[PDB]
Design a protein around this ligand. Structure first.
Ligand SMILES: [Br-]
Lengths: 362, 361
């Protein structure tokens, strides 16, 4: 029904069915936003609709690192532990290379590619401990293996999806990855989490090397905090190319070295968050963070809302349609558009079993 | 120039000690400092030494990740000095200073003042910073040391705007944000908000008798503190988080009980050690307190001397159209200062045991 597609792992589906059963029995009260979205339909009892409504509770723009209290006021810890494992992919038209600020370079002809919003580990909050913190932290220390398992759970669905898609397109997949969960979703671990994320990526690609034959190039760019390097994981080329260390490196929304549109599909991973739509900050009109810049530099808003925006080259952002912004004062963001048109974030949802992708448990 | 820089007395002690170690001793300058030095013809004057050290700052710097605290950029002494340098300017505030699309354009732009003060730097991609070495004792954040740091960095601007309100036969209304609290805190984001609140209250209660013409101070950390109102001597200290209390005036607007007729409006900006006033907006991004407050005012016009044009649909002070004409893509003021060779240099003053000038010792 929509243009995007949500994916989740198998342990995530186990948690989902456990939470649904505990809600059906009575020993679990939902969160405010989840119950809010529920109190708009007429059912309870179906699993994919439960998950779709839980995902619909997400708001267009949320500061996941300070604006959430992790209780009934917004989202419970079970709801958040589920939402943090939900990724969403979509076909996009990349208008520039994805550079931040004024560093973006407009593509002469816009590139056709794919985005995969994956929410990173949330290790910061203005209130109490988060679920991810309770998961990958052992007495303050950051557990490498637990973080690897978390990122595997959150990334393998999109990896296998784009593997199969590259197989269907008779091409290979070149995936550009940023410093996911490293900007400010790390809080007190910003100074140690980049090598942990690099090792998590390398471990995921080494553990499932034989299951991703059509993935060819992985272009990891944490801007800084890591040495530029090249590693050969089975048949794949994992390139750590920090843009602040290696000048002239290909942007996130551009084909890395050794890939081109004829022999490669261009897919880019986006640092998402637990409680926001794809684009987060740009839903408030700010072209910030990996999420916001990658959404503004593509037609993400057009794909989620269904509207037909127009890309502005002097500003490097996908602008809302002129029919909306016509008689408004000041700046009008896409959040105003979703509020005026009653647009909700809801789309098809799939899960990974012990092989392929489906939607039921068994 | 249009701006004016201020520093405390301990800052002048550190400056003269570093200068003496440079005149003849075991102390090498930094790359950017020596670079700015290697363009003039002097060596051994105090205000020019400090002016060139301040000129070492670049238009847009990520002070929280891009500095190694050594010879590659700035040494720790240079950083301990630069973090204590504030700069005040007369500005024309065009909107209320809201982030994103939440800004509301003033019908008539307000005439006011900005005071860029660098907050406590408690995060770096390399080793410990000077501020960290100053206000941290075995990981713990010392409240009194942070109070002393913010005193050194704020009291000069406080007395400056006190005297300015006295000269204009008005009073001073100071809007203060969550300085050094957003992400320049690293592992202290969850504890630094009440510490900054306590630092402000301690500074204003300790030196209340020295600031008779400042009346209303409107502190807004957006979120993370309860809304409150306190009467410190004759002053009104209002904690009004904009994310909890809807309808708040804002950082670039007169708080309740003040207007241009009876109050001068000055706003404090969370600056950094190594950047020009405006930092992120020098890269074309209207982000952070620094960048948003610079884009919503004529800060770039006052620092570069050029005559920009304010865009209402975007809430930003744009480079001149004659400049911005035949360009590809977006165009920041950093390109303007790079193409026109504009440098950040202005008058510098210090505080003795009373007022501010520069007789040193
Ligand atoms: Br922006």
């Amino acid at each position: 029904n929509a243009a995007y597609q949500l994916l989740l792992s198998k342990e995530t589906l186990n948690k989902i069915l456990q939470y649904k059963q505990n809600l059906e029995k009575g020993l679990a009260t939902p969160g405010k936003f989840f119950l809010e979205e529920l109190s708009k339909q007429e059912k309870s009892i179906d699993i994919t609709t439960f998950t779709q409504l839980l995902i619909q509770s997400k708001k267009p723009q949320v500061f996941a690192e300070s604006q959430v209290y992790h209780d009934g006021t917004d989202w419970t810890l079970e709801e958040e532990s589920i939402l943090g494992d939900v990724s969403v992919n979509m076909p996009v038209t990349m208008y520039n290379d994805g550079g931040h600020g004024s560093s973006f370079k407009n593509h002469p002809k816009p590139i056709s590619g794919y985005l995969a919003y994956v929410p990173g580990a949330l290790l910061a909050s203005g209130s109490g401990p988060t679920s991810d913190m309770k998961e990958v932290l052992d007495n303050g220390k950051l557990n490498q293996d637990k973080l690897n398992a978390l990122y595997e759970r959150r990334l393998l669905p999109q990896l296998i999806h784009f593997n199969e898609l590259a197989r269907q397109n008779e091409k290979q997949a070149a995936i550009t990855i940023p410093g996911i969960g490293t900007g400010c979703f790390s809080g007190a671990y910003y100074d140690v989490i980049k090598p942990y994320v690099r090792n998590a990526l390398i471990h995921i690609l080494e553990k499932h090397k034989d299951s991703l034959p059509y993935i060819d190039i992985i272009h990891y760019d944490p801007y800084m905090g890591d040495e530029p390097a090249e590693k050969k994981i089975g048949h794949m080329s994992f390139r750590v190319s920090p843009s602040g260390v290696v000048r002239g490196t290909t942007g996130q929304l551009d084909y890395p070295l050794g890939s081109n549109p004829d022999t490669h599909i261009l897919v880019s991973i986006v640092a998402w968050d637990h409680f926001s739509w794809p684009g987060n900050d740009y839903w408030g009109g700010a072209r910030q963070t990996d999420d916001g810049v990658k959404a503004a530099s593509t037609d993400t808003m057009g794909q989620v809302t269904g509207a037909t925006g127009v890309y502005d080259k002097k500003w490097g952002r996908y602008m809302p349609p002129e029919s909306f912004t016509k008689d408004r004062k000041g700046m009008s963001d896409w959040g105003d558009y979703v509020r005026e048109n009653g647009i909700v974030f809801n789309g098809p949802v799939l899960a990974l079993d012990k092989s392929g992708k489906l939607d039921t448990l068994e």
